[PDB]
Amino acid sequence: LTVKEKEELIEEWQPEPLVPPVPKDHPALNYNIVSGPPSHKTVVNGKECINFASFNFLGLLDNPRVKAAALASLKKYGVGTCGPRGFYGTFDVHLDLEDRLAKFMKTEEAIIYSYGFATIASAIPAYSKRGDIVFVDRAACFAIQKGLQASRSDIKLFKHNDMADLERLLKEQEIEDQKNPRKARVTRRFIVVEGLYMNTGTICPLPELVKLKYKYKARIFLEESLSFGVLGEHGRGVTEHYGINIDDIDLISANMENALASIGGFCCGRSFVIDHQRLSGQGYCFSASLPPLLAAAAIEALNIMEENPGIFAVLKEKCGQIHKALQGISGLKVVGESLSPAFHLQLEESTGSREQDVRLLQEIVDQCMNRSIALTQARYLEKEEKCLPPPSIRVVVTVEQTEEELERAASTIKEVAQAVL
């Protein structure tokens, strides 16, 4: 079968090129070059502007204090580590930041990853395995969706923000419980939820979702990468907002990139669950650890939070009066809660094409740069995303924004919204 002369004859086969021919028209083909630091008054594309698309909710970026502590650790440790944290790659800072972070959440133990996107994509597949079940909000972020596609388990998604669909979907699994109880006593059930949603800022109901945890035997995997240092009297995430004991939740994972204004991510819990990620955490062991000038900026920034915890109050009042402003805008609506500092400015009446819509929203974003305002639109991978959101502008509000610069930002966007639509 298939003679040698015949076999070579089959070597005429030509393959596809590696990369498809990217066109001259796309979404963000052209990046915004920014001169200087991305501070309050930034210079995007050679144009002075007051930005609304950076994620430093607490200031803490161009802080004189924070930057004095990171410099005092650059002159005694160098810039980087050299090894992957099990091989001569732990400093004093790494051990001291994990002690401080855990005491700030009044939990038992924490852990540190050196990247923001690999702290959850490496923590979901360490527990969930081949024969398990996960229940996902369906409005979850991309980082969650690639930890789920790595754990190889049966994935069921309920509707956004309702407990009637997640109660409907646990009962269907409790019927297959009794039709095979021999193998239905060895498949752990998990629930993955997000504290505040990046794709649509709304707060999930924990109070009526935790008492449902004790009914059915299902665990909770909270993920507050956007409410960590925002919601709460002491900014301890969403659990302080609703008032829930931290032992009820099994795992909480944030990143040290938004409120802490640095690089990295953590994951705090109880010691019965955190001690397993040190040997099976993908991005933990097969990766070099976090550099020690970034771990000294995260201790000092965590210092400042507690020195004066009344700042969280001038972040909640700030994000309440810009949510009241943009309401009369004709052509596009406001999607979000009054506590969430990252609402989307979704388009009110769509045309019937994503391409045609993306370009329409850009017209407004390119125009407001001429003025004081600076803002971006939400970027997504349409090919790979499981549930794709509509196109929208993202408006972030920090603490270093006055009342004079919020009404200026709402009247300007209200004026050029009727000049494009």
Binding site: E7, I10, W13, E16, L18, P20, V22, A28, N32, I33, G36, P37, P38, T42, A53, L61, K67, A70, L71, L74, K75, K76, Y77, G78, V79, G80, C82, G83, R85, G86, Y88, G89, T90, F91, D92, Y115, F117, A118, F142, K146, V186, T187, K217, D247, E257, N258, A261, S262, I263, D275, Q282, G283, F286, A288, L293, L294, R379, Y380, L381, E384
Partner: protein, 497 residues
């Protein structure tokens, strides 16, 4: 012009590399060691029934929770029986800058390695051979290091956005153009984690109906990123050109696995320095073989980029080839340059695609401004004292490897490859080689089981160009003394001078 093969890959310099076959006497004793520990490992499970003293470990809520097991009893039977026994050999904290002499915090356990305490005294001068410090760029006092880091530090502590929104600073483009001139490619793109270079750009480039030809022992990032895509994965033998030629002309004359539809594309995932082994990729026999079968090569060099070749320009300068034969070159800035992050390297057709369709560029944050000027103001430190530390690293490896081979040990790998794996083919010598060298004031890395094969427990000795002749002769005198104490001198061939 020195050695040509049945493929076409013409070698220009001799390729000396010998992996000694483990002696059959040692190979029996290993099993008795892994067998006895397995035998006593159960007993601690049969004595976990009474539960009188489970205090060492932790437990579930019991009153609350206590519904499903969560962990598989048999799954974790290795991390609580064979590992926890000698666990004091890995996570050793450091008080100072890592560079040829480091401070170690001294700790001590009373529970037979279940919980530690830190006494208070540190060990002052410890020759370390476990840090990746090729070319000695890991200091706290340097003209390149002090000026670049400090000015940049005032810039920003960290970025707070993404490359497609406001995460693109002016520091990120002057790196990209500099990396492209270093290698000799059209363009490049920097990421911020080497582990997320591989596990976020491979599922952008392969897809569904394609085939991935991966080596037997890759890094865990190439294995992870090849699974996040959805392409068929077929694994060939480590550095075996016969088993790559067979496994590739059987993938074209047979198409897909359920139909017989032809594939869309074929790409080959190889490496560079192979640290767990120490061998180098037979790179003229892959380029002269992928052109016969029209596949793509994802050459990646993280442990070579600044330690191989006349001017430390990766493995492509080493074999005398141009960076045009390969595509998607990978790399990390953590080993040679001493800074975190990674790049990819290609042509504009490819790059313009990854600035647009990669997972890291749209979702995750970027490099930080102080770790990016440590790269800019030290990459420049090579082109011009830059060619001295490359020539110093290449003669520290020739001395340290031949004199360590004339003592009778088994050393894997190539004659010019700056990781030197020493064989400890036994479980009890894993916990004893790491423990006895601290008494002797030297720190090393001992890897056992998990990463490697059952009967292949070894020790790594990553060298440096900051190790002088007087530091190496201190280390080689103590390895000779701790080699006779544990009988680790076994090789039929002894290269006597």
């Amino acid at each position: 012009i020195h050695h040509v093969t049945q493929n076409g890959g013409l070698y220009k310099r001799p390729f000396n590399e010998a992996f000694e076959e483990t002696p059959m006497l040692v190979a029996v004793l290993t099993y008795v060691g892994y067998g006895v520990l397995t035998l006593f490992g159960y007993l601690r499970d049969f004595l976990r029934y009474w539960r009188i003293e489970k205090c060492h470990h932790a437990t579930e809520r019991e009153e609350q929770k206590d519904f499903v097991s969560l962990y598989q009893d048999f799954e974790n039977f290795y991390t609580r029986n064979l590992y926890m026994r000698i666990r004091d050999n890995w996570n050793r904290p450091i008080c100072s800058v890592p560079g040829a002499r480091v401070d170690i915090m001294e700790r001590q356990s009373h529970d037979y390695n279940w919980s530690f305490k830190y006494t208070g005294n540190i060990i002052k001068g410890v020759i370390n051979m476990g840090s990746y410090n090729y070319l000695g760029f890991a200091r706290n006092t340097g003209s390149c290091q002090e000026a670049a880091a400090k000015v940049l530090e005032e810039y920003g502590a960290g970025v707070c956005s993404t490359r497609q929104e406001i995460g693109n600073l002016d520091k990120h483009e002057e790196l990209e153009e500099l990396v492209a001139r270093f290698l000799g490619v059209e363009a490049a793109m920097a990421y911020g984690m080497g582990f997320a270079t591989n596990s976020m750009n491979i599922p952008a480039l392969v897809g569904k109906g394609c085939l991935i030809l991966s080596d037997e022992l890759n890094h865990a990032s190439l294995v992870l990123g090849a699974r996040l895509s959805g392409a068929t994965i077929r694994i060939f033998k480590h550095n075996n050109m016969q088993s790559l030629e067979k496994l590739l002309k059987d993938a074209i004359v047979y198409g897909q696995p359920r139909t017989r539809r032809p594939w869309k594309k074929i790409l080959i995932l190889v490496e560079g320095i192979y640290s767990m082994e120490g061998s180098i990729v037979r790179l003229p026999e892959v380029i002269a073989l992928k052109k016969k079968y029209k596949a793509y090569l994802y050459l990646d060099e993280a442990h070579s980029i600044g330690a191989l070749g006349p001017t430390g320009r990766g493995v492509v300068e080493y074999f005398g080839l141009d960076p045009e034969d390969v595509d998607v070159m990978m790399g990390t800035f953590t080993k040679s340059f001493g800074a975190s992050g990674g790049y990819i390297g290609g042509k504009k057709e490819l790059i313009d695609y990854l600035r647009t369709h990669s997972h890291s560029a749209v979702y995750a944050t970027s490099l930080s401004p102080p770790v990016v000027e440590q790269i800019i103001t030290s990459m420049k430190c090579i082109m011009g004292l830059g060619k001295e530390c490359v020539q110093q690293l290449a003669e520290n490896t020739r001395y340290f490897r031949r004199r360590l081979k004339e003592m009778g040990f088994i050393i894997y790998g190539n004659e010019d490859s700056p990781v030197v794996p020493l064989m400890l083919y036994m479980p009890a010598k894993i916990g004893a080689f790491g423990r006895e060298m601290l008494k002797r004031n030297i720190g090393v890395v001992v890897v056992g089981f998990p990463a490697t094969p059952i009967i292949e427990s070894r020790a790594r000795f990553c060298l440096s160009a900051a190790h002088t002749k007087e530091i190496l002769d201190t280390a080689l005198k103590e390895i000779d003394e701790v080699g006779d104490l544990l009988q680790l001198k076994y090789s039929r061939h002894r290269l006597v001078p």
